[PDB]
Short mmCIF file of C-alpha atoms and ligand atoms in Angstrom, two decimals:
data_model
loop_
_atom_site.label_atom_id
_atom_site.label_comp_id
_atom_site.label_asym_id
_atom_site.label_seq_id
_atom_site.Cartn_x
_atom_site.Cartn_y
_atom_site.Cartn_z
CA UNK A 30 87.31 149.76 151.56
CA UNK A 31 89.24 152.84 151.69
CA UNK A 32 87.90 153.24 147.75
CA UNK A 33 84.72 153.61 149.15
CA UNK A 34 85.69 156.61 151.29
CA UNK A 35 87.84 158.32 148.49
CA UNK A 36 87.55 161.35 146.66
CA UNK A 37 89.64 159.74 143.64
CA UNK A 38 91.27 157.26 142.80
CA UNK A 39 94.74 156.70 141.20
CA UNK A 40 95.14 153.25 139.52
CA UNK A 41 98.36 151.63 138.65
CA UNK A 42 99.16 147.98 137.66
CA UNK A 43 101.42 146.90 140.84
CA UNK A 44 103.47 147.44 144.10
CA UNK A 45 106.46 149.98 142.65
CA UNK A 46 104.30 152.30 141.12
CA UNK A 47 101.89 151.91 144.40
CA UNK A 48 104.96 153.40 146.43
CA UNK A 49 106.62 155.60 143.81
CA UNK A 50 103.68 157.72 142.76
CA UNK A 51 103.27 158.97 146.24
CA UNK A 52 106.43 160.19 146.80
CA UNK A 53 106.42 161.99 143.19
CA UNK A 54 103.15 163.98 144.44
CA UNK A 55 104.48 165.05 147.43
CA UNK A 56 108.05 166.54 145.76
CA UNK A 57 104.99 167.87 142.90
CA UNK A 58 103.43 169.44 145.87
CA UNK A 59 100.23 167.96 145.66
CA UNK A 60 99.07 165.94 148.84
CA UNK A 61 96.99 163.10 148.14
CA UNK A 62 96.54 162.11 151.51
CA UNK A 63 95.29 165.50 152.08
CA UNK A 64 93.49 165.32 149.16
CA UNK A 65 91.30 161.70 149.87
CA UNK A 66 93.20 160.14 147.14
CA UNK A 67 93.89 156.68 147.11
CA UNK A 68 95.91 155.02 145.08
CA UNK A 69 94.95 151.69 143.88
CA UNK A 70 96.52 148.51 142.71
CA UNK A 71 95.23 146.58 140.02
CA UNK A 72 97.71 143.69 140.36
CA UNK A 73 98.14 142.84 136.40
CA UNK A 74 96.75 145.08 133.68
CA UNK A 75 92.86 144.60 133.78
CA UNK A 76 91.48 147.88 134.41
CA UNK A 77 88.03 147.02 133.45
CA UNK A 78 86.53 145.98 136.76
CA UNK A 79 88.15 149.09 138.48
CA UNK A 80 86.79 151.60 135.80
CA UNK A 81 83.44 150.11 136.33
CA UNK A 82 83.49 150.20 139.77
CA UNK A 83 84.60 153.91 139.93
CA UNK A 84 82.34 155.10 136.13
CA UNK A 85 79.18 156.21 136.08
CA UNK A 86 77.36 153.34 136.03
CA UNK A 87 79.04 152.45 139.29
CA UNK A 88 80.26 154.94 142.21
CA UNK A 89 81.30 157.83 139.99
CA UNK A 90 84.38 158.42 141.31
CA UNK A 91 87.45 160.69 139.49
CA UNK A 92 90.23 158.39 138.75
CA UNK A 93 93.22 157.99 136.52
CA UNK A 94 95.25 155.23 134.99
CA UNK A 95 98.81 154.83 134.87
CA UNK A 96 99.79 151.85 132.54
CA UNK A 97 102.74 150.49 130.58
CA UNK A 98 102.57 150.79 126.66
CA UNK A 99 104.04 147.03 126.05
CA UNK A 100 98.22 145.23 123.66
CA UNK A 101 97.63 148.23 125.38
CA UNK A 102 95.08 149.45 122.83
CA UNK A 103 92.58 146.88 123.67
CA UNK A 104 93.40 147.39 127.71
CA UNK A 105 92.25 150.99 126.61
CA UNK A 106 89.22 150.16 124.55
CA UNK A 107 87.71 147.99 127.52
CA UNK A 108 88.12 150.69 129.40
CA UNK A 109 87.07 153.63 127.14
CA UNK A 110 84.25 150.96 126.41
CA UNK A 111 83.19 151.53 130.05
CA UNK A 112 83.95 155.27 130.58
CA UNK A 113 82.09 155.77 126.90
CA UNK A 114 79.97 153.83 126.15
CA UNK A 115 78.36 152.85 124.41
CA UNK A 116 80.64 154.45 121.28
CA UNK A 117 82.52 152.20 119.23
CA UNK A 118 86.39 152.35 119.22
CA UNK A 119 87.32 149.25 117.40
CA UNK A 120 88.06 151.39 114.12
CA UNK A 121 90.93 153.20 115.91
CA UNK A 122 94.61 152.49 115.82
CA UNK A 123 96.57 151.91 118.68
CA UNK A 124 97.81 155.77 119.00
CA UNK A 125 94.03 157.75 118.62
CA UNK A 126 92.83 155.10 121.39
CA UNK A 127 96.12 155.92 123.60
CA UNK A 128 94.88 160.14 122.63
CA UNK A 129 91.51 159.61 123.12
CA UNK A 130 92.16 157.84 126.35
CA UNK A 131 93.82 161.09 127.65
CA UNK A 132 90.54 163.17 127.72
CA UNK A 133 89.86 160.63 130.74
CA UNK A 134 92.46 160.64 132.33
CA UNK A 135 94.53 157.45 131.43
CA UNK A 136 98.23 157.58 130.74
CA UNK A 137 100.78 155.31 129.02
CA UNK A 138 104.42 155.02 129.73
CA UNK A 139 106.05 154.46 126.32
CA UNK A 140 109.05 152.69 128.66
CA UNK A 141 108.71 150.62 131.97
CA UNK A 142 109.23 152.36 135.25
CA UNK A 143 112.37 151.18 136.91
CA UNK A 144 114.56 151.53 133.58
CA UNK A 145 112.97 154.84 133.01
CA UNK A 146 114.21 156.41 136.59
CA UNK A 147 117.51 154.47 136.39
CA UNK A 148 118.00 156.26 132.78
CA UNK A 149 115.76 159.87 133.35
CA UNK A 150 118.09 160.50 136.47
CA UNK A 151 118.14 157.94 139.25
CA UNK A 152 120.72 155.82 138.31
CA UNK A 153 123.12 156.27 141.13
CA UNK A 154 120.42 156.10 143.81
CA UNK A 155 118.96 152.56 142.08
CA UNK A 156 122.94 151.45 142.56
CA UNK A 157 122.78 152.26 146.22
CA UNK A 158 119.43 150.22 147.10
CA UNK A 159 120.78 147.30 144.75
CA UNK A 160 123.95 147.31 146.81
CA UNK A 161 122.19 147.62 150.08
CA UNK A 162 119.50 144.79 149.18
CA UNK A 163 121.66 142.57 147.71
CA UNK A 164 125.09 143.11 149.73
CA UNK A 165 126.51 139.74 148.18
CA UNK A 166 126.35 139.97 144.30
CA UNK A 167 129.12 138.70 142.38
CA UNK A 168 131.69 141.00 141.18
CA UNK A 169 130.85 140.62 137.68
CA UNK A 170 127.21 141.66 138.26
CA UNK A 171 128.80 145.02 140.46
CA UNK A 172 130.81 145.55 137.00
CA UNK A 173 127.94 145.87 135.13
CA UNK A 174 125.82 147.64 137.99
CA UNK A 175 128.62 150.12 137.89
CA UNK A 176 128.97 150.36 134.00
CA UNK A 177 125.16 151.41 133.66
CA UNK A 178 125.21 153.85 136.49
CA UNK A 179 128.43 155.58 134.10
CA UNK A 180 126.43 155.20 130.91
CA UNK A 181 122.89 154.81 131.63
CA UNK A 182 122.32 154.78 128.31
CA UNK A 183 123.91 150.98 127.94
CA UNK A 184 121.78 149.23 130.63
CA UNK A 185 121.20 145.50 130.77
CA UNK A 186 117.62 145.66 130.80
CA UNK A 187 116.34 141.73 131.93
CA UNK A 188 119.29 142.25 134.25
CA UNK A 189 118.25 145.37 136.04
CA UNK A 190 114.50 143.83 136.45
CA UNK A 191 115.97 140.59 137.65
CA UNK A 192 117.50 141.90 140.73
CA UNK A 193 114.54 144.53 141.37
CA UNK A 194 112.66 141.39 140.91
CA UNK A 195 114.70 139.53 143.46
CA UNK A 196 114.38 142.42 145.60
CA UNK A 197 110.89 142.48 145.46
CA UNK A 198 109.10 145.19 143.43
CA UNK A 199 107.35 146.34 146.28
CA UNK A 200 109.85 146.49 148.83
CA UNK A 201 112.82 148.42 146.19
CA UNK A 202 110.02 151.20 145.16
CA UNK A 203 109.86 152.26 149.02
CA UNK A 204 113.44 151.92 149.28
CA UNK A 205 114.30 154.51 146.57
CA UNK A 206 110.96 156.74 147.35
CA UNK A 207 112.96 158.88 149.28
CA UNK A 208 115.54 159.78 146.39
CA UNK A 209 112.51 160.78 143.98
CA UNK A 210 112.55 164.54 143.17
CA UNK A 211 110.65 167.16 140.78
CA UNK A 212 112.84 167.07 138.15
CA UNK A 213 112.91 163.09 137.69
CA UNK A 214 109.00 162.85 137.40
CA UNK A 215 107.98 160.77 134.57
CA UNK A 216 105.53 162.74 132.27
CA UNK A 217 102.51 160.06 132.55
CA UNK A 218 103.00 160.06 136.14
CA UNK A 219 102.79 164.10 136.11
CA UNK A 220 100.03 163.64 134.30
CA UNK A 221 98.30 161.31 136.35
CA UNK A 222 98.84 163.26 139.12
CA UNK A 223 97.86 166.46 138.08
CA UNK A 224 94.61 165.41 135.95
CA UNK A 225 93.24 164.01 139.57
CA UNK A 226 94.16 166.96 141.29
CA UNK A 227 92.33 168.99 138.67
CA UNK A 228 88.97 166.96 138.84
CA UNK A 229 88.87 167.25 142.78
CA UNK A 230 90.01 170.83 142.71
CA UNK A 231 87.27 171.70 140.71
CA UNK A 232 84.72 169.85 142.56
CA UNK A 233 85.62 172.84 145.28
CA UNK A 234 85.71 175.40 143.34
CA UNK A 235 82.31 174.78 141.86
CA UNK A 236 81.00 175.87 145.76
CA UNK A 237 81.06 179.29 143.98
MG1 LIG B 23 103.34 152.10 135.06
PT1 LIG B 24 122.80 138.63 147.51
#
């Protein structure tokens, strides 16, 4: 509904990057609000209906992708299927799809999000909405909260997700949006961001 009245489109597989995107672009400076952006969850890792809907056989709308590496090269030839077709891409590896794929604006983490931001940089802040969500946890579980906030390096990985999990993906994303800054940005998600900013940018510019 609101896709329909957008000048682009961010898509992103679920409810943490839904909330945590946002608050990168506005410590990037770049107002997607402002902008008619919407960002748009997928709910899973199926692109393909979104691309078409937003390609040029549909609306022909600028959008991005922001999606987790994990398989991902056939998530990226449905889509580069859609967005270029009709070339064939089945004769690529899984790196010159993920490269190609960049010309359009689609982005791969090579991590997942929340271990990324507890390990790039918001490991202390993560520790704080943990405690705060779940103000019961046994000690042992504090012991290791507190031994991956000192070495972030040595995280419990199923662990961590559990309790985000528990938390709800959703509703821990909005919690720690306000602790994002600038220098914490994941590079796909600065590269999201920017790419759609480009493409709407220049739709103004061409006025001239
Ligand atoms: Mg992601
Ligand atoms: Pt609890």
């Amino acid at each position: 509904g609101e896709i329909f009245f957008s000048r682009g489109v961010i898509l992103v597989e679920g409810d943490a990057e839904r909330f945590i995107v946002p608050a990168f672009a506005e410590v990037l400076n770049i107002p997607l609000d402002m902008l008619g952006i919407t960002v748009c969850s997928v709910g899973g890792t199926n692109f393909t209906p979104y691309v078409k809907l937003l390609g040029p056989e549909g609306l022909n709308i600028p959008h991005v992708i922001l999606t987790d590496r994990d398989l991902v090269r056939r998530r990226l030839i449905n889509v580069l299927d859609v967005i270029e077709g009709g070339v064939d891409h089945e004769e690529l590896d899984a790196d010159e799809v993920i490269k190609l794929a960049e010309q359009y604006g689609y982005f791969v983490n090579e991590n997942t999000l929340e271990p990324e931001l507890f390990a790039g940089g918001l490991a202390e802040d993560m520790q704080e909405v943990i405690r705060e969500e779940l103000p019961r946890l046994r000690r042992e579980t504090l012991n290791a909260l507190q031994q991956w906030v000192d070495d972030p390096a040595q995280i419990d990985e199923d662990l961590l997700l559990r309790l985000i999990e528990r938390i709800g993906k959703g509703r821990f994303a909005q919690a720690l949006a306000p602790s994002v800054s600038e220098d914490v940005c994941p590079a796909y998600i600065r590269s999201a961001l920017e790419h759609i900013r480009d493409a709407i940018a220049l739709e103004h510019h061409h006025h001239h």
